[PDB]
């Protein structure tokens, strides 16, 4: 790659054809809809939880991705390491908005389940979610005695699902929910970054922080 | 304004909430729709015609907007000065696409009408539009003996209207047609630049050239 | 290319490594330097002259670059077609700044020379350049009876050369003058766009209009 | 603020006049310079340490900035909470480059000093810094028995100082070192973001991650 690559104004102005939306446009699109159920992926959607995953990786499997199948990792990740996870502003805004509408708030995660979890609590506390709006984190997947994320969406009648990963958007699509994309921060340790907008879905502006 | 204003990454990554689309996405949204009528504003939508407007302003009214109510200007502008107008690439793609589909193509302009006009021919020539798809330019407005752009869109059953200006999109909105925005180039002499996406309409990416 | 390519925040925030400068920064870098000679390339540096080039190409050689070796083209281009050329705002700022400082202003072009030329006058008129600061356009090249752009910069003791093309900056580099890049507009008909900053030179921000 | 603010291509292409540089351009600028001393701010320069500061703040002073004057906070921040701090790629690249040159690597921080600190170790381990290149973190400030960051730069003959905050760049400027800016991540909890480039200094591209 050249030492001085230069640029040109076609590249400076170039836009990908993304359907960008704001929080205000989403609220507007819902105006006069009665209280409903909506859901959020957790990691890189409402929490920059990379610190915990990064400590996990270094502590348990510095040379592979095996820490993610290790129950001792998950016990720590789910029971306190979220105290170093940084709440996303986009999620504060969306959650306050959905609380303002009287909506029911669900969090649906692909994290491995553990005996106990204080994530539900970290989320109710960090985002000021009233007990009445709040629901215990749902641990979805394809282990025996789990339902998948789409089954949970169908089961909870979740109408809007917010998330950063392709599987978040497809899961919403599968059950006819509205999948709305959030940008993953470029300093996340989960890489490569997804291509936000890859299914033609709404992507929220400035949602990396 | 500071000599060294500096910047930051929230500002470098910031996106306005615009519904961007590509030509390809628009062609796909129309897949299996039979032939229909579509229309295009001219100036800064399919032709960068500032050269003639600029020449006009300097020649007839260096000091005002008066040239635009001068019939001697309009006669030069519509009978040759578009030989200096530069066709937009976005318009070559859109028009080739609509030709492919077998659509009827209309140009609806706010330019003042004149005895004769060679703009229709400049457009059929520059854009390789088959006579069968092509239609003479419609000069629309609020002069006696004119109909408005909206009435013309209703009259021709134009389903899609492309334009750079707010009135292009609202004229489409008036009659229930799909208004699609094209970016006016920053070197156009028509200023200020419109706020593309001001009505929540689709805006075509990279459509300034 | 995918219908929905999507994007990500590493790509939204990505910057090429360019030395951007403002007109204000350049004026400040010259603070308390006495009057000097500076020069400007014409086409896409101070005038968006694509209208005349475009008209030329269609009229004389729809199918080649031959129009550019046609004396009948050059006679039209240099004796009036610049009435359709659109002055760049960056050039109004730079030239007003250099006039302020009392600098001698040169235009050095690669256009083919002709019997007469009204480009010098178009530039003195459009840019309000005082006759005392102004100099007739220098037509430079490798034709017999010509000197090259570099020799002209050496000959006039031009300390700063502004231009959009690689040869503008390298001609400056050849003779030890400060080469400063201006962005060619994306609707110019001269393609491909140069890679501004390809030599580690300064590039003026927003200089496409 | 409007629900549909729109945009225009002047804004889409608009650039701040920053002197952006790459890691390769910096190495190139140093080529054939003998081994030297160079230094790095820590927080948001080589480590996204916001997780630790964010846990600190919530644990010790949820309603003020007093945690930053609390020694119990600093003992935890400096003795393990960096295990959740995320190394910046830009810092891996710069440190490997400066290690390749045989340079001496210093880290100079404004963190309050504590009895012990394992930050030096976290940094040597995460960035693979050979013992011979590595130096214990220097805790600078204006407490009694400290030297300021500029005094330390002068004292260690540090020739290049990398950092995200204005005080990093001014400290380098004060002693005639080369201050090079790194972009603070927009998900940092330390806000507002600095204006990278505010002294006309080099800013490294894409240095938020
Ligand atoms: Br391992
Ligand atoms: Br493991
Ligand atoms: Br813990
Ligand atoms: Br917020
Ligand atoms: Br479970
Ligand atoms: Br699942
Ligand atoms: Br993904
Ligand atoms: Br990536
Ligand atoms: Br589509
Ligand atoms: Br006048
Ligand atoms: Br007039
Ligand atoms: Br094209
Ligand atoms: Br009308
Ligand atoms: Br408008
Ligand atoms: Br404007
Ligand atoms: Br300056
Ligand atoms: Br030909
Ligand atoms: Br020819
Ligand atoms: Br101006
Ligand atoms: Br030459
Ligand atoms: Br070039
Ligand atoms: Br190009
Ligand atoms: Br407190
Ligand atoms: Br405290
Ligand atoms: Br610890
Ligand atoms: Br790296
Ligand atoms: Br100390
Ligand atoms: Br200090
Ligand atoms: Br700062
Ligand atoms: Br900020
Ligand atoms: Mg996620
Ligand atoms: Mg128009
Ligand atoms: Mg040029
Ligand atoms: Mg810092």
D192: CB partners within 8 A, 6+ apart: none
CA B133 – CA B103 distance, rounded (Å): 6
Q: Which residues in chain C have their C atom more than 2.5 Å from the N of the next written residue, marking a break after them?
A: none
Sequential DSSP letters for C145-177: T---HHHHHHHTTEEEEEESSHHHHHHHHHTT-
Which listed ligand is nearest to A167 at the C-alpha?
Answer: 7
C125: CB partners within 8 A, 6+ apart: none
Give the bridge partners for A202, in sequence order. Answer: A19, A180
Give the bridge partners for B48, in sequence order. Answer: B86
Torsion, Cα D87 D90 D91 D92, to 10 degrees, reads 80
How many separate helices (H) and strands (E) can be counted in chain C?
Answer: 8, 9
CA A170 – CA A163 distance, rounded (Å): 10
Q: Which residue of B has its CA nearest to C80?
A: B55
Q: What is the resolution of this structure in A?
A: 2.2
Torsion, Cα A98 A99 A103 A107, to 10 degrees, reads 80
Structure tokens at D104: 């001496």
DSSP B43: B
Task: State in Å: Cα C73 to ligand 17 middle.
Answer: 13
**Which of A3, A9, A208 has its CB closest to that of D24?**
A3
- Helix ranges, chain C (H): 9-13, 23-29, 50-60, 71-78, 89-101, 119-126, 149-155, 166-174
Cα dihedral across residues C23, C26, C32, C36: positive or negative? negative
DSSP C36: -
Interface residues of C toward A, Cβ cutoff 8 Å, are 2-13, 16-18, 183-186, 192-200, 208
CA A122 – CA A135 distance, rounded (Å): 12
Give the bridge partners for B109, in sequence order. Answer: B139
Largest Cα–Cα distance of chain A, in whole Å? 58
CA C161 – CA C108 distance, rounded (Å): 9
CB atoms within 10 A of CB B36: 15
Question: Alpha carbon B59 to chain centroid distance?
Answer: 25
CB of D99 closer than 8 Å to CB of D133: yes
Q: Which residue of B has its CA nearest to D13?
A: B186
Which listed ligand is nearest to A112 at the C-alpha?
Answer: 5
- Helix ranges, chain B (H): 9-13, 23-29, 50-60, 71-78, 89-101, 119-126, 149-155, 166-174
The DSSP H or E segment spanning A28 is helix A23-29
CB of A105 closer than 8 Å to CB of A129: yes
CA C190 – CA C50 distance, rounded (Å): 7
CA D179 – CA D156 distance, rounded (Å): 15
Residue indicated by tokens 């659509």: B103
Residue C135: is the preceding peptide bond cis (ω within 30°)? no
The DSSP H or E segment spanning D30 is none
CB contact under 8 A, A3 and D85: no
Residues from chain B contacting residue D6 (CB–CB below 8 Å): 16, 18, 194-198
Counting every residue written for chain A, the total comes to 209
Task: State in Å: Cα A79 to ligand 3 middle.
Answer: 6
Going by their DSSP bridges, the two strands B86-87 and B47-48 should be labelled as antiparallel
Experimental method: X-ray
CA D206 – CA D188 distance, rounded (Å): 15
Half-sphere exposure of A196 (CA within 13 A, CB side): 31
Best CA proximity match to D103, nearest among D94, D111, D90: D94
Residues from chain C contacting residue B12 (CB–CB below 8 Å): 12-13, 15
Residue ranges of domains in chain D, CATH in brackets: 1-209 (3.40.50.1000)
CA A99 – CA A97 distance, rounded (Å): 5
Is C59 labelled a binding residue? no
CB contact under 8 A, A4 and C17: yes
Residue indicated by tokens 């330097």: C33
CB contact under 8 A, A24 and D12: no
CB of B197 closer than 8 Å to CB of B181: yes
**Which of D28, D83, D208 has its CB closest to that of A187?**
D208
Task: State in Å: Cα B106 to ligand 32 middle.
Answer: 14
CA B180 – CA B23 distance, rounded (Å): 11
CA A207 – CA A90 distance, rounded (Å): 5
Task: State in Å: Cα C91 to ligand 19 middle.
Answer: 8
CB of A31 closer than 8 Å to CB of A63: no
B155: CB partners within 8 A, 6+ apart: B147
Best CA proximity match to D38, nearest among D108, D120, D88: D108
CB-count burial class (<10 Å; 0-12, 13-18, 19+) for A130 = exposed
Half-sphere exposure of B29 (CA within 13 A, CB side): 13
Cα angle, residue D91 at apex, residues D79 and D150 outer, rounded to 5°: 75
Give the bridge partners for B107, in sequence order. Answer: B40
Best CA proximity match to C7, nearest among D45, A128, B16, A194: A194
Residue indicated by tokens 């390298």: C170
B202: CB partners within 8 A, 6+ apart: B19, B20, B21, B26, B178, B180, B181
């Amino acid at each position: 790659s050249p030492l001085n690559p230069g640029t040109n104004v076609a590249r400076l102005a170039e836009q990908a054809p993304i359907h960008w939306v704001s929080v205000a446009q989403i609220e507007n699109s819902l105006a006069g809809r009665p209280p409903m159920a909506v859901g959020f992926d957790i990691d890189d959607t409402v929490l920059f939880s990379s610190p915990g995953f990064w400590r996990g990786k270094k502590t348990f499997s510095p040379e592979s991705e095996d820490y993610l199948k290790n129950p001792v990792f998950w016990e720590k990740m789910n029971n306190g390491w979220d105290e170093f996870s940084i709440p996303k502003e986009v999620a504060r805004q969306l959650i306050d908005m959905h609380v303002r509408r009287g909506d029911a708030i669900f969090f649906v995660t692909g994290r491995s389940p553990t005996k106990t979890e204080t994530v539900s609590k970290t989320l109710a506390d960090n985002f000021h979610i009233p007990a009445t709006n709040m629901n215990p984190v749902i641990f979805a997947g394809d282990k025996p005695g789990q339902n998948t994320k789409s089954q949970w969406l169908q089961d909870k009648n979740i109408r809007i699902f917010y998330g950063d990963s392709d599987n978040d958007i497809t899961a919403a699509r599968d059950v006819g929910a509205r999948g709305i994309r959030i940008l993953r921060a470029s300093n996340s340790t989960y890489k490569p970054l997804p291509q936000a907008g890859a299914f033609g879905e709404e992507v929220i502006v400035n949602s990396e922080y």
